[PDB]
Design a protein around this ligand. Structure first.
Ligand SMILES: [Zn+2]
Lengths: 121, 208, 50, 205, 156
RNA sequence: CCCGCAGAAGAAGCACCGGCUAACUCCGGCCAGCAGCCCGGUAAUACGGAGGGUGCAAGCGUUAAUCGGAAUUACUGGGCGUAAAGCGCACGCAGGCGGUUUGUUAAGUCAGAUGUGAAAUCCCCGGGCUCAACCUGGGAACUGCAUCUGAUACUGGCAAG
RNA sequence: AUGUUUUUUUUUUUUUUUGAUUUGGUGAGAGG
């Protein structure tokens, strides 16, 4: 605080670590599904949340949420993950409508966010 | 169900009865039934007319009805056209000669039942219940009520969890028997459910 | 009529502190004259002296 | 790059008459100008602090027919320039070629004026200018070219204008169909209902 | 002539034998678009009543503020409890650059042009108070001259 | 770049609408799903569809990343009795700071000048591409460094008190 | 002798004040 003190030893900047380190400063990363499964969320919620453990291109083994209703993913399915954490230990989302992950069926609103092409009529 | 009915506790002292006749155990039940019928009919008919109190009084095998209403003009219609019509039906209901009298209610804001009815109507036509209640209270006060209370209950503003709210103004002594407490009730059959409206109007204390 | 015998710009607004056609419906800017109204903005008795 | 939808809807939303239709027929007859658009029009709860500002911004933008990025740019320019920011912005808006044309009375609406500008009808100092955003300067004569001078719409527009109040900052000739942008307008010359300050605040978040 | 802005309304509770009794606090502020400002803090079982009370409070115990044209006379700090507030006079056109409760008070006061940051707490009630204090303390050139035994041209 | 030809012709989507946050209704059971932080168990403005609206617009969302907000490392600009924070207490080298008067010096300090501080970029006034972006003339700026000439209140050095 | 031992959203917006109750010539007839 004291100017002399500051001079002696300056002020330390708070180094904030990244909450999506398996990306390694990439907007998305390609990965292969090591396994796909459902998981129960913590309190107070209740569901069977669809999630896949993904071995990434850069070597990391992470677990990625699968948004939307329904998915085609199996083991050995090449998917793109984007970062974003579902509110234990899931810090990433599968990009629907990229690589092997399909767009959500019968969806008409927020279509972009689930890979869905524009409905023709 | 805490409270005693304010009319009912005072029938011997400051409040009078509505049905005012004598009958032996033989004919009493029948008479009561008749009264119920006629009253029901009247309510059905004179809904649009602001009617407070039907007073039935049967001497000598002939029924005398007395309708207390705020606007006689709509109950009477053209001079002795609607009243007459009412009479024959009343007679039919009873099975005796009928006679309808129509008392004109001075100050319908001070009559409790009428106020309640008004409130119910308001509720039905989708006003803010609270604003209606306020209006009811205020108006009575303006008119010269020593006090008024109103209470409304259940599904207020179509809310899932029902509750009761009530506005008092002035003094409304219920434990005091000699207090002229005009009490009455009504029910708003809204889209979300029933909303019950109670209203107490304290005219003043009687000294005897 | 704009602008005839009973004009707006030449004399004044019929209503008090109102553009007859449409602007100023409170008490803040008494005087502004838009092109859509071609109207002054004063009292109801202002036309009696003009 | 333009708003192509219902014009009166916008006006309704705003509350005021934005002058998005010529003014032959009064706005109250064409639409429920008091009632807001859509299913939930009759309901009107008091707006937020942010919201009012936003609305104000929209109004101004709507009036001139300027999309958001452009508007932002204009605001920035105003800020950069010396003097009062809101006023400057207003001046800039006015300065637009299409707006100027509208003022003159060669377009019934601002939209019409813009269209005319686009279609190589208008000249500024005897040189065909096609850009609606073109900032017209002081002493810059602006006219209809001889090809577009025969159009019935132009005369109608002029007539409409003649009914409408004449701006002091211009000087227009109906026969010659050429107007001189004499000077950039003062704030007093413009409409008082526009709260420029709100707009300024909105961008000063 | 007076303009009045309800800044915030907050529901506050009192626990009793039965359960929770709820009530409403209304923070308002009123001003004449010139020096005079006054905030009022009213409380009642229903909102509108509370608001009314607040307004009433505001209308009495107003305070005068020396305003050089649309803006303040010099940069002024004002503190109250957690909320410490800085506000700085600004050129015509800039508008009220200030956040929340602070803005409202300024607007009624009839300052049109300010640059104002609220450091510390931003608890509306405290911050408005702080703002008021700042306004109050702020002296004019004439006043300063009077204080110092000089003319206005000596001070500039 | 200009002129002529035809005919509204070939040309609008994306996100969002519980609060923060601009925008609301109806129809489908802690499931399916949403989520940036703080819904869903049968009347969900929070899930999905619709109608309606709001915001952006040839883009619109999402992700990643940086500053901002964050006075949340606080030089400007924070704190430490109870919220995190006074060494258990002292002595004391280096270091930091230093009562008062005069003289002197002129290191710090201040003033002016000179040299330099590449051009571009930023900013001001202009000019040129129909406008704009873009290009561009001149200025200002580049908060500095060096040197020379002064000023000597303050800080420092030296000398006496 | 002893208690973090059955938690689940059973959810935060007023009225506002600011303004008024509205009827011109012509001709005919009566009272004093
Ligand atoms: Zn007007």
């Amino acid at each position: 605080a004291t100017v002399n003190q500051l001079v002696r030893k300056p002020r330390a900047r708070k180094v904030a670590k990244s909450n999506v380190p398996a990306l390694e400063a990439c907007p998305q990363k390609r990965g292969v599904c090591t396994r796909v499964y459902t998981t129960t969320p913590k309190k107070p919620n209740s569901a069977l949340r669809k999630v896949c453990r993904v071995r990434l291109t850069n070597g990391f083994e992470v677990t990625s949420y699968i948004g939307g209703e329904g998915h085609n993913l199996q083991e050995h399915s090449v998917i793109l993950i984007r970062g974003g954490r579902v509110k234990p230990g899931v810090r990433y989302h599968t990009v629907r409508g990229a690589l092997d992950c399909s767009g959500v069926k019968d969806r008409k609103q927020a279509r972009s966010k689930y890979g869905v092409k524009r409905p023709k009529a | 169900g805490q409270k005693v009915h304010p009319n009912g506790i005072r029938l011997g002292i400051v409040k009078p009865w509505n049905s005012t006749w004598f009958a032996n155990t033989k004919e009493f039940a029948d008479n009561l039934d008749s009264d119920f019928k006629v009253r029901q009919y009247l309510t059905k008919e004179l809904a649009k007319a602001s009617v407070s109190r039907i007073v039935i009084e049967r001497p000598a095998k002939s029924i005398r009805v007395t309708i207390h209403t705020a606007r006689p003009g709509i109950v009477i219609g053209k001079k002795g056209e609607d009243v007459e019509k009412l009479r024959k039906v009343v007679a039919d209901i009873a099975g005796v000669p009928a006679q309808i009298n129509i008392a004109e209610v001075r100050k319908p804001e001070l009559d409790a039942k009428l106020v309640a009815d008004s409130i119910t109507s308001q509720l039905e036509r989708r006003v803010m219940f609270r604003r209606a209640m306020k209006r009811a209270v205020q108006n009575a006060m303006r008119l010269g009520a020593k006090g008024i209370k109103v209470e409304v209950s259940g599904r207020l503003g179509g809310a899932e969890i029902a509750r009761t709210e009530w506005y008092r103004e002035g003094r409304v002594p219920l434990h005091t028997l000699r207090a002229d407490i005009d009490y009455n009730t009504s029910e708003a059959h809204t889209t979300y459910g029933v909303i019950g409206v109670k209203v107490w109007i304290f005219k003043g204390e009687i000294l005897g | 009529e704009r602008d005839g015998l009973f004009c707006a710009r030449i004399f004044g607004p019929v209503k008090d502190y109102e553009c007859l056609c449409g602007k100023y419906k409170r008490l803040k800017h008494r005087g502004v004259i838009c092109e859509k109204c071609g109207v002054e903005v004063t009292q109801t008795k202002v036309r009696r002296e003009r | 790059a333009r708003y192509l939808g219902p014009k009166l809807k916008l006006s309704r939303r705003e509350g005021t008459d934005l002058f998005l239709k010529s003014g032959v027929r009064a706005i109250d007859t064409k639409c429920k100008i008091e009632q807001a658009p859509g299913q939930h029009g009759a309901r009107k709860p008091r707006l937020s602090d942010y919201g009012v500002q936003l609305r104000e911004k929209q109004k101004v933008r709507r009036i001139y027919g300027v999309l958001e990025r452009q508007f932002r740019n204009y605001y920035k320019e105003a800020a950069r320039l010396k003097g009062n920011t809101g006023e400057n912005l207003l001046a800039l808006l006015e300065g637009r070629l299409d707006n100027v044309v509208y003022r003159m009375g060669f377009g019934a609406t601002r939209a019409e004026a813009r269209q005319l500008v686009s279609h190589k009808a208008i000249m500024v100092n005897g040189r065909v200018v096609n850009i609606a955003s073109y900032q017209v300067s002081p002493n810059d004569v602006v006219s209809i070219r001889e090809k577009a001078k025969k159009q019935s719409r132009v005369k109608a527009a002029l007539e409409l204008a003649e009914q409408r109040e004449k701006p002091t900052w211009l000087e227009v000739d109906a026969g010659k169909m050429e107007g001189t942008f004499k000077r950039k307008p003062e704030r007093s010359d413009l409409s008082a209902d526009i709260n420029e300050h709100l707009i300024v605040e909105l961008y000063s978040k | 002539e007076l303009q009045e802005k309800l800044i915030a309304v907050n529901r506050v509770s009192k626990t009793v034998k039965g359960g929770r009794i709820f009530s409403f606090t209304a923070l308002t502020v009123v001003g004449d678009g010139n020096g005079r400002v006054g905030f009022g803090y009213g409380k009642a079982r229903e909102v509108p009543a509370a608001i009314q009370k607040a307004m009433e409070k505001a209308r009495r115990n107003m305070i005068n503020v020396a305003l050089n044209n649309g803006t303040l006379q010099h940069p002024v700090k004002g503190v109250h409890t957690g909320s410490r507030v800085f506000m700085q006079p600004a050129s015509e056109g800039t508008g009220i650059i200030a956040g929340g409760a602070m803005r409202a008070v300024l607007e009624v006061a009839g300052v049109h042009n300010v640059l104002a940051k609220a450091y510390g707490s931003t608890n509306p009630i405290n911050v408005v108070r702080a703002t008021i204090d700042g306004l109050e303390n702020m002296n004019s050139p004439e006043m300063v001259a009077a204080k110092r035994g000089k003319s206005v041209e000596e001070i500039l």
